Amino acid sequence: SMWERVKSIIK
Amino acid sequence: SMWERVKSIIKSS
Amino acid sequence: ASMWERVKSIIKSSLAA
Amino acid sequence: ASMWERVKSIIKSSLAAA
Amino acid sequence: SMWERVKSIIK
Amino acid sequence: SMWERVKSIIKSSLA
Amino acid sequence: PVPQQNVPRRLSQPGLAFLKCAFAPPDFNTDPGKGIPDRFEGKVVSRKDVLNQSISFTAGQDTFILIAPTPGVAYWSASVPAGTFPTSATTFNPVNYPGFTSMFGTTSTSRSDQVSSFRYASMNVGIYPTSNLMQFAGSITVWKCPVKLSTVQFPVATDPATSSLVHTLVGLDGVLAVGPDNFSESFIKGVFSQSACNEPDFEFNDILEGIQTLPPANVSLGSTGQPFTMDSGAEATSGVVGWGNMDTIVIRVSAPEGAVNSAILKAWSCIEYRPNPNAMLYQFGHDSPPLDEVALQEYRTVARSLPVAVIAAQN
Amino acid sequence: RLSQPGLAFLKCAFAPPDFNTDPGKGIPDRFEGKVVSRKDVLNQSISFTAGQDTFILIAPTPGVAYWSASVPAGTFPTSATTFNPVNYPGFTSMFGTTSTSRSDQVSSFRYASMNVGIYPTSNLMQFAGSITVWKCPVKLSTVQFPVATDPATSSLVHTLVGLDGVLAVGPDNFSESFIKGVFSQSACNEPDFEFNDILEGIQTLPPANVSLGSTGQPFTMDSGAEATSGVVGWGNMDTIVIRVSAPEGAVNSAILKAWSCIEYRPNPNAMLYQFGHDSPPLDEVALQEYRTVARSLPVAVIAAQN
Amino acid sequence: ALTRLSQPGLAFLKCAFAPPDFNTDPGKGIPDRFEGKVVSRKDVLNQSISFTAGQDTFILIAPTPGVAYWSASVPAGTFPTSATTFNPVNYPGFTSMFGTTSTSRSDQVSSFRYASMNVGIYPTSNLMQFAGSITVWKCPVKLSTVQFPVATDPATSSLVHTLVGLDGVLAVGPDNFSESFIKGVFSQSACNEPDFEFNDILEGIQTLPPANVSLGSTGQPFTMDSGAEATSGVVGWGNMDTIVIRVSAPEGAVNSAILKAWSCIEYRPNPNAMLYQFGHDSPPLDEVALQEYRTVARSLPVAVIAAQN
Amino acid sequence: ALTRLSQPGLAFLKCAFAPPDFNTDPGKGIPDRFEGKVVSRKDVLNQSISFTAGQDTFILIAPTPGVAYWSASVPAGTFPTSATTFNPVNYPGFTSMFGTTSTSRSDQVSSFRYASMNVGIYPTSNLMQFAGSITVWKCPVKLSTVQFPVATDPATSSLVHTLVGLDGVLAVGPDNFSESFIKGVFSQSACNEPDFEFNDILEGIQTLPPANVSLGSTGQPFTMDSGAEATSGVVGWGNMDTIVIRVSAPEGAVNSAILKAWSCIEYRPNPNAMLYQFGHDSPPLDEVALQEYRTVARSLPVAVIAAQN
Amino acid sequence: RLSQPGLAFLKCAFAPPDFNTDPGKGIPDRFEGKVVSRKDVLNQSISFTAGQDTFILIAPTPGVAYWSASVPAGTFPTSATTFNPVNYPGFTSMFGTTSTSRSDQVSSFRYASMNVGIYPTSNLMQFAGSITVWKCPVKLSTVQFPVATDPATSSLVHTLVGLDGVLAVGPDNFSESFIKGVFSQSACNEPDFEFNDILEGIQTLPPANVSLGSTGQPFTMDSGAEATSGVVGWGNMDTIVIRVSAPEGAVNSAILKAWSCIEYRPNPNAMLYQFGHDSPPLDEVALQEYRTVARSLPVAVIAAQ
Amino acid sequence: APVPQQNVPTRLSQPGLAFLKCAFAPPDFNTDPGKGIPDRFEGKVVSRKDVLNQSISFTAGQDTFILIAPTPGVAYWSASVPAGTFPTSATTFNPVNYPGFTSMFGTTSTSRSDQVSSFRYASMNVGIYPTSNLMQFAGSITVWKCPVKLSTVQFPVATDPATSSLVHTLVGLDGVLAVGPDNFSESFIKGVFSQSACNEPDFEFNDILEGIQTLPPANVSLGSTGQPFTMDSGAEATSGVVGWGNMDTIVIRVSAPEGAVNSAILKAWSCIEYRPNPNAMLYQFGHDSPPLDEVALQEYRTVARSLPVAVIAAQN
């Protein structure tokens, strides 16, 4: 997905 | 009272 | 395998021999 | 001294006086 | 000193 | 009598 | 599968003084402005301007007053028949701050001899009635509009034909109607309003040259697209120098037939300048205050948490 | 750690199609004035012409979704190519029907998001082609040239700079088959957000009675009649260039989508002033995460993961 | 306590304040919020200039990209007048980046922002023939417009570029550095804005004021010229303070020196051009580095002698 | 085993043999005796090509700097004739390096030498309409001169450039790779000299044979054209083997692909150019890497499928 | 480890003026044929003019020491500039007296070293100016263009490539005052030493009846009459560029010296064939040290050392 | 103030033995053992060996000069001058071809590259074997070498409008007009055997030139080039000049006084390499070059230095 990928970037 | 009202807002936060 | 694997294998064989 | 020395002195004084 | 510079480089 | 000359030269150089 | 590459993998004294110049001018003996405590720390010159004008309103007409962020000019005024709004046949005229020629010369192309940049920090206004409780009649309304300065482009039929680019004003249509957010009361109570920066930061603006009337000469009002005309008159008295990042205050005073209205009008300013080394005012300058985050946040908070206007008894 | 406005800003900035409705409500910066937030979405069904290349530009022009033109296959746009706009819904209700009536309702604007997407609608028996995506930093500037009138004067007209990067694919690009789609984003190219004034009287770049050669622009950007579309400004965003190639005998049909997260400054006499509200306050964490995520994302991804 | 700053911040400070103290110029970019792709260009000039005796020489270090300085000469004891024209001296490689046509300046780059600006003068004359002095001060020149009517059929109005702030070169600023000629000088300039903003690339500008426009209609004191369009031109104006240097030579003096300049600049490259290969991401944000940059800019004097550069 | 090779040797091998297996930084330079100042120019292309049904397409990967390939179309089952002309496709950024005039190619550089040259074709069409094959073989083309008299007054003799070895394109070489179209291809070239030598820059060449010289008096089989001097041209010819690729398509077949090219090239920059800022020293000598270069080049197939790149 | 020929080669390559007599006797490479080594030294006293700039090119042209030209102060050479040569003693004894007799004694050559130095001879009351040195890789190439004759044809002529580096000072330079002097050296720009042929008929570049515009050169190079000087080749060494600026009212004088370690292929009919000898054999360590030392040296150095 | 400065900085292998045998001792072995040059290059090459057997008779009272030059496909060039003299401006040299020249370089002056595009030499030898008896012969034999190369000459022409020309020329031919200090001289009845060696530090590939039939070419005078004499090649369908390798040139002078009757047999060898065109028939006979071998090159240089100029035919 995309929002999951972004969510992993922050963490 | 214009300055007395300003100090009220700053004291709030 | 890929191409870099082939190059590595060739180098290893050449150095071994 | 040189210019870099005085810049270093300025920065060190500012950081020590903070 | 140029011959000394070359000699120092070879060391 | 020419290849012997080259052989002698090579042997002398290696020696 | 095509391979991919290059994939990424408390307060301080300057701040309090700034707030005092911003929000409460007339509550202190001396103006305490010092400067804007932002990142910039160069050489600046601070100026404060106050005007004290006596005005009497003509009965049976509607008077409009604009407090524009144009340096050296206090306000622009025009009069229209009662119950109406400014139209294409109306012209606005300025009233200068004292000492305009001492800072911007006596010619249209001599406005940048002493300064080259500016930025606003405050702009206020006030009205105090001076009539008895029997003569007067009417009301006072105040609202704000976000006017900006931009450019327009139109063709012209010369030999050979060409194209032209001239300055315009965008947002003047907010004067043609009353905004939903406004303050309306009786005439005898007065008014007091202020303005705030409409930008996320403070930036310096240049000094324009040659501007006397908007639209300029030899240009029709239709091509520009403005609802009315701004005129300054002779160049030896006044002119247009620039446009800052502040909102415009619009004031309408209505008076019915047989009413005698008189009042006193005031204005304020807290403006920084960038001086030229050869100017005579360069020696009055100083350095800008350093950074102060708390003041910069409380400025926005207070500006957001204030009413549009208050009566003259709460100046 | 973040607040609701910052998270909503991130959602509008990066992942539009992952939620039922757009949650964004402003840009959490220092500005806290009166603004009107509008979200514009386009839904177009486009069939590409076989034997030609189609170029699509996603430019930061308010009220216009994209510009497009067609060129012979294997080539690039030249001095004889002209781009035409495709409008967002309700252009005239906000920008009028005259070239000198663009500022009657709004005064300025600033961008917060810009995304595009392509979804193929062809079966596994007729598709043939590829999609290439790369970004260019196009800006708006001015040019000065003399004209010999009586007496001779000097002119000054608008001109787009940076358009020369369209005529070559950069080393940083995404390229795959047509059947995979694409999904690309954009981000601000300035250290901070700021407002831009609404322009007036601009229809075609370059303007009429001005030669193309004297301006330096590689090609033209026409807008047609004044009652249909026009150019009202240029935001602080990076343009997106998409090239679609289709060989003869192939049938390519896709769905084109575009999103936006835009703020305005409404006029008091306008009819849309009632919908306004205050901009959200400052939030440092949201801005820092925005910068980091915008730096760390790839150029484009296949449409399967959007 | 220099471990409180990241490497990019220290490199930025080293570029900004002391170029000539290192063998290789240290710098990767500006540690601000912007983290896009930029190309860092380092300009160095090595020019030897001989000053005429009995004349006053003015040198302007203006923030015009691709140009080192502008110079003009006037009779000794006087100041530039309406008949004085300044001419530029280019950095090595002007035509390799800005073309050879006045309408081709944006074929490689589209925007820029200045990061540093330094200058230095090293005398080379003997101690028995020199004479004169060196004066340095700064003026805030900016680029603006001017509007004036024109009498054509039909009549119209015009808008042309102009420079506001050139009046500061007609007198010596109260903040100045004065010393003997044999001592040299070394000065630097800093940003005049609260933030680093990208400026666009202008086109068609050769001489200010432009052709067909007479002086006095613009309000400028003097003229700026660039000559042929295939050699030099004006492509922009950055956010920096202009440094003005005046060297006075009395009659019978033999004055000569070596002039040097440096500049850190950031460009936005086009994929069409070749320099796009060397682009890299701008360094991330460093707040303490910016605070120390402001402090050091406020702390240093206007100029120092060449022995303390 | 792999610790007997220095880092420059490994980087050189990587750029020479396997470009597309790594993300960034293919290599540094050529590790030979020369240790001067060079600029490494890494080129890459991304072009979408559609092949006409009923025609045969020929692609030549020539060692001409600044040009990716030359292409021509012939009816199926035939080979190029005297009427066939090849047109070039440029790398991104030609005019920014070799000017815009025929006599201005040596302004930024003076000499060059190749280090690597690769190609790759990736199919794009579906599995139900494609038809044809791909054939690859290598030809040793060189550049020489041809002399012939001219009947002027007085009569003189002319010496013009010519290409020798172009007859290899008229037949399929015995050492060739052939397979179906849907599988792609990947091939590379190697140096054809005992050592790496620098080649100069030629000026004024726009067509081979040039104007006013008729093909047939030079012995060339066909013509090579480059078009207007402001877009493309010929600047030199390195020491590498030309790669010939033939794609055949019958009637009713829709064929399309994406073409990618790579290049490790070393340049000698000029002091007045902008490229001089990015120069560096060539890596020193490494004998083991030089031996493995020849060994691997000799122990590799002509080409492989695109899935094994 | 280091044999005598390798040491002698290093001495002739890097430090000529430190020894009573030259040691070099050849290049220690694979080639071992018959050569005739030669060392050329020029000793000249020059007085630079006032109010002008002087540009000196140490080009790898056999038999010629340097080329010089003058331009107005504060400028660079333009399209109207012309460079003129100053040659070593004994040009006619080796290269004849006509333009088509340059190969009657030798047929090939290859350089080994190329050095220069300036020693000021002015007191402490006259000198004024500076000295700047930088290197430019100039090479010899060809250019083609059409001619409008009856019938029309094409022409191929010689042309120097890389001359644009003289119009701007590069980042890698050396600059100091005039009273200090300078001393710099050049090195081979090829991975191996190879022989070059002897050219014939070259007097000016660009040649006669060919305009400067059609060749792409920035300026001109002229050698004058055929009986005094000429161009016979171009070796594989980088060109050294020197700019000397002198103000008005100053007196600058110095002594200019140049050295050259060179090799030749003699002809059996020539009178210099009796002086020849065999080239020294291979020596790897000497070549490696040559590469390292040539890499590690700075651009220029004051005349004190 | 001082101005700141910145940017400151073992046994041999079979290929080696075969190479030495092809280089130094051709006629001793049953079959030529040559394989290839053991350099770093290991590409596809075609190797050829050329031998010519010609019976020659020398005119009594004249001096005969023979040049063994590195011109592919050509054995030697011959000229004759009166006894006691040397070649002059009127002397012309004509070639003698190896077998099968037309089968390799075509019959058209522009067809020279239809089969190959590059070459490089590896050996070159020559020998003379007298056949006359011991009562009718008289004379001598002299052998020396010259380093002839190929270059260009530039001169203007007064056409309308005037232009500048550039043609081909040979430099170093002046070594034929005098006897060299390094030479071998003996009686005629004893013969001679000689060989040449490379004159460059490395083995490189040349290119095939087109259109050369004469030097100086047509419509060019001898004075403009500066050459001592001419080198004709006859009809374009028979022979021509297709290149010039990196080898020395061997010149042989045979003096025959009045009344002498000299006859002999002339031989020539050539150990050569080629770059084949993929469309040629010769491509099928090709192979790959042998790998590197340092000792072979070292002994090659040593033996090349340690051998005399020539020996008598009894020690061929």
mmCIF file of N, CA, C and O in Angstrom, chain K residues 119-136:
data_model
loop_
_atom_site.group_PDB
_atom_site.id
_atom_site.type_symbol
_atom_site.label_atom_id
_atom_site.label_comp_id
_atom_site.label_asym_id
_atom_site.label_seq_id
_atom_site.Cartn_x
_atom_site.Cartn_y
_atom_site.Cartn_z
ATOM 1 N N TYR K 119 64.045 33.936 -13.193
ATOM 2 C CA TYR K 119 64.853 34.489 -12.105
ATOM 3 C C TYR K 119 64.912 36.005 -12.227
ATOM 4 O O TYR K 119 65.578 36.521 -13.146
ATOM 5 N N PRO K 120 64.253 36.758 -11.346
ATOM 6 C CA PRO K 120 64.253 38.219 -11.483
ATOM 7 C C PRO K 120 65.626 38.810 -11.206
ATOM 8 O O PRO K 120 66.379 38.313 -10.366
ATOM 9 N N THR K 121 65.946 39.884 -11.925
ATOM 10 C CA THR K 121 67.198 40.614 -11.764
ATOM 11 C C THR K 121 66.931 42.098 -11.560
ATOM 12 O O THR K 121 67.636 42.957 -12.097
ATOM 13 N N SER K 122 65.905 42.422 -10.780
ATOM 14 C CA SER K 122 65.535 43.799 -10.493
ATOM 15 C C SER K 122 65.749 44.097 -9.014
ATOM 16 O O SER K 122 65.576 43.226 -8.157
ATOM 17 N N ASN K 123 66.126 45.339 -8.724
ATOM 18 C CA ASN K 123 66.353 45.754 -7.350
ATOM 19 C C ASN K 123 65.018 45.961 -6.637
ATOM 20 O O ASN K 123 63.939 45.749 -7.197
ATOM 21 N N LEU K 124 65.089 46.390 -5.379
ATOM 22 C CA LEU K 124 63.914 46.528 -4.530
ATOM 23 C C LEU K 124 63.257 47.899 -4.646
ATOM 24 O O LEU K 124 62.590 48.338 -3.703
ATOM 25 N N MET K 125 63.432 48.587 -5.774
ATOM 26 C CA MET K 125 62.837 49.898 -5.974
ATOM 27 C C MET K 125 62.166 50.034 -7.339
ATOM 28 O O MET K 125 61.655 51.113 -7.658
ATOM 29 N N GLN K 126 62.124 48.969 -8.139
ATOM 30 C CA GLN K 126 61.588 49.063 -9.492
ATOM 31 C C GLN K 126 60.474 48.055 -9.749
ATOM 32 O O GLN K 126 59.558 48.326 -10.532
ATOM 33 N N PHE K 127 60.544 46.893 -9.106
ATOM 34 C CA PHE K 127 59.661 45.791 -9.458
ATOM 35 C C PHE K 127 58.212 46.095 -9.089
ATOM 36 O O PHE K 127 57.926 46.777 -8.101
ATOM 37 N N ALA K 128 57.297 45.577 -9.907
ATOM 38 C CA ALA K 128 55.862 45.667 -9.664
ATOM 39 C C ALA K 128 55.121 44.715 -10.593
ATOM 40 O O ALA K 128 55.364 44.714 -11.804
ATOM 41 N N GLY K 129 54.224 43.904 -10.048
ATOM 42 C CA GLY K 129 53.438 42.983 -10.836
ATOM 43 C C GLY K 129 53.376 41.625 -10.176
ATOM 44 O O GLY K 129 53.855 41.430 -9.060
ATOM 45 N N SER K 130 52.776 40.669 -10.885
ATOM 46 C CA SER K 130 52.596 39.317 -10.376
ATOM 47 C C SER K 130 52.849 38.315 -11.495
ATOM 48 O O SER K 130 53.003 38.679 -12.664
ATOM 49 N N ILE K 131 52.894 37.037 -11.121
ATOM 50 C CA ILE K 131 53.127 35.936 -12.049
ATOM 51 C C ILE K 131 52.097 34.849 -11.774
ATOM 52 O O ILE K 131 51.928 34.428 -10.625
ATOM 53 N N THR K 132 51.417 34.390 -12.826
ATOM 54 C CA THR K 132 50.406 33.347 -12.717
ATOM 55 C C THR K 132 50.718 32.224 -13.695
ATOM 56 O O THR K 132 51.073 32.478 -14.850
ATOM 57 N N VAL K 133 50.578 30.981 -13.233
ATOM 58 C CA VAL K 133 50.907 29.797 -14.022
ATOM 59 C C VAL K 133 49.762 28.798 -13.913
ATOM 60 O O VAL K 133 49.272 28.529 -12.812
ATOM 61 N N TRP K 134 49.340 28.251 -15.054
ATOM 62 C CA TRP K 134 48.382 27.152 -15.078
ATOM 63 C C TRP K 134 48.604 26.334 -16.342
ATOM 64 O O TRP K 134 49.232 26.792 -17.300
ATOM 65 N N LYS K 135 48.083 25.107 -16.332
ATOM 66 C CA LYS K 135 48.351 24.117 -17.367
ATOM 67 C C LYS K 135 47.106 23.870 -18.212
ATOM 68 O O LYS K 135 45.989 23.829 -17.688
ATOM 69 N N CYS K 136 47.307 23.701 -19.521
ATOM 70 C CA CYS K 136 46.221 23.450 -20.459
ATOM 71 C C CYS K 136 46.608 22.314 -21.400
ATOM 72 O O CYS K 136 47.692 22.353 -22.006
#
